[PDB]
Each structure stands twice: as structure tokens, then as C-alpha cells.
């Protein structure tokens, strides 16, 4: 009664307590979800209405552990605020309880800021692609100065040649660069296709630098001289492969033919990602 409604209304006060206090805390880690969640009343959220909702493949920033059943964090999305996240055991328990009444881990740890990776317009290690990507890296360096780190990744991180240890340490380095929520951009030599990082926990923002016309790409390659035109076919084949991918495999597609327009598009996207990852106080 109000015998009981002493404790189970002081619990709600003590929960709202921690929740406001975590608003200022740093992000402990991020996860990419493999499942969706929307709270039902019977889920017994420490503060009613304060559970977050998400779909599979969303990203969550986790601040702290409230108890064994609930974490505190936010959906990485503009406007979304701190709330309760069900822990994996709580998700399992809801399923099990649901089955009883009627009678694949849910989270992957990923960097707190998704690393930006550029693919296209063709293969890296040739002039057209390396130079076009270089101009983009240089733009970002100044456009996001003070909020960004751009780093070369020579080790073959798609292997998660390069030893296992060398790959693991580069992966750990990328996680660390993102820990304080600055933008992270990789110049990753070996990555030419989005499917190359799909099995890692890097969860990149994949930027497709796309030349719409194969004729245009061929002419660009030829403009580099016969030392590059010797390798025309392998570059043309690779660009055609990117062009066959469904657009949803890419987070950003830069098909603008002017550097400044491609830069503005990418900057607008990353500025919005900055907002999604840095909620107002």
C-alpha cells in the first residue's frame, strides 16, 4: 500500500537522481545494437517513461551501469537524451518471461566516434583515387581543426601481410582516438570496399567518393600518363564494383564534380554527426 509506496517511490527518486548526474559524465563506451528495443510497462524501467528506444544497427553512448538490469545512456541522434538501456541479461530475461507467460549478442562495442573511411572513386594506391582523397583529407584537417584527428592506417585492418597483433593494436589505437569524442578520420590504404570492414567492430562511416561517369574516370586516369593508364582496367573494374553496391552500404555518397561541393557535403554530414554525438548541456 502506502506501506509499500514508501520504498517503491523512493527507488524512483534515487533512479532519477543518478540519471541527472550521468548527464555530465563522459561516455564510458559505445555500442552498435543488433536488436531493437521499445519499453513495455512490464519491463519495469527504474523511471517510467525514461527507457530509451532504438532499432537494430543504431548506436548508443553508455555513461554508466545503473544496476544489473539497466545501463544509463543515449541513442546517438540529434535531440535524443539520456535514459535507461536494458542490459543483455535484462533483454534475455524479458524474452524468457514472455515465453513463460505464453505457456547473437544484443550489443557490440564500437568506437565512441565512428571512424570516417573513404572509398572510391577507384582503387587506392593509384593517382586518381589517392589524389582525390588527399584533397578531402586536407579540407577536413582545416574545416574541423581542433575537433578532429586524421591518421594513416597502413596495417590491413580488414583482416580483423599484417600480423594479428599489428592489426589488433591499430584497432585499439582507433578506439582510443575516439574516446574523447573528437572526429576520427582514417586514411586506410587497404580499404577499397565497404564490405571490407563489415566484420570488424570499427563501424566506420563509409564515404563513397563517386565519379558517376566511367568515361570521365577513364579520361582522368589517362590524364595521369601512361604509367597510370597501364593500370586502367583494374581501376575501371573496381569503380564499376562500387557502382553496383546498393547505396545503403554507404553512409555518405559524394558524387559532386567540384571539390568544394564535395567538401561541403561531407562537412555538413560530419557537422550533423558532431551534433548527434555532442548533446547540449
Amino acid at each position: 500500500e502506502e506501506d509499500r509506496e514508501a520504498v517503491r517511490r523512493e527507488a524512483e527518486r534515487q533512479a532519477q537522481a543518478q540519471l541527472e548526474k550521468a548527464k555530465t559524465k563522459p561516455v564510458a563506451f559505445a555500442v552498435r545494437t543488433n536488436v531493437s528495443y521499445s519499453a513495455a510497462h512490464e519491463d519495469d524501467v527504474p523511471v517510467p517513461g525514461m527507457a530509451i528506444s532504438f532499432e537494430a544497427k543504431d548506436f548508443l553512448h553508455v555513461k554508466e551501469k545503473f544496476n544489473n538490469d539497466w545501463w544509463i545512456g543515449r541513442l546517438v541522434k540529434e535531440g535524443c537524451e539520456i535514459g535507461f538501456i536494458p542490459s543483455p541479461v535484462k533483454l534475455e530475461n524479458m524474452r524468457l518471461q514472455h515465453e513463460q507467460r505464453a505457456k547473437t549478442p544484443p550489443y557490440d562495442v564500437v568506437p565512441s566516434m565512428r571512424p570516417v573511411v573513404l572509398v572510391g572513386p577507384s582503387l587506392k594506391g593509384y593517382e586518381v583515387t589517392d589524389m582525390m582523397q588527399k584533397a578531402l583529407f586536407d579540407f577536413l584537417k582545416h574545416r574541423f581543426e581542433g575537433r578532429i584527428s586524421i591518421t594513416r592506417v597502413t596495417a590491413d585492418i580488414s583482416l580483423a601481410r599484417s600480423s594479428l597483433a599489428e592489426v589488433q593494436s591499430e584497432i585499439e589505437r582507433i578506439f582510443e582516438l575516439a574516446r574523447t569524442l573528437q572526429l576520427v578520420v582514417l586514411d586506410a590504404d587497404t580499404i577499397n570496399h565497404p564490405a571490407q570492414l563489415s566484420k570488424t567492430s570499427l563501424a566506420p562511416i563509409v564515404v563513397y567518393v563517386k565519379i558517376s561517369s566511367p568515361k570521365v574516370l577513364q579520361r582522368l586516369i589517362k590524364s595521369r600518363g601512361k604509367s597510370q593508364a597501364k593500370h586502367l582496367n583494374v581501376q575501371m573494374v573496381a569503380a564499376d564494383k562500387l557502382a553496383q553496391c546498393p547505396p545503403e552500404l554507404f553512409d555518405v555518397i559524394l558524387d559532386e564534380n567540384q571539390l568544394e561541393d564535395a567538401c561541403e557535403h561531407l562537412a555538413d554530414y560530419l557537422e550533423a554527426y558532431w551534433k548527434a554525438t555532442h548533446p547540449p548541456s
Partner: peptide, 29 residues
């Protein structure tokens, strides 16, 4: 003089000039 082919051709000229300029901007960094 198929007009569609004419504007396509002009679009490809613009694309090429744009990308050539893009590459040049990378070269002088």
C-alpha cells in the same frame, strides 16, 4: 544533333574539368 546526347556530352566535359581541378588542388598541398 540529338539534344540529349549534346547535354550529356557537356555534362561530361564539366565533370572532367571539375575533377581535373580537384586533383590539381591536391597536388599543390
Amino acid at each position: 544533333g540529338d539534344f540529349q546526347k549534346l547535354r550529356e556530352k557537356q555534362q561530361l566535359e564539366e565533370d572532367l574539368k571539375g575533377y581535373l581541378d580537384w586533383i590539381t588542388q591536391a597536388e599543390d598541398i
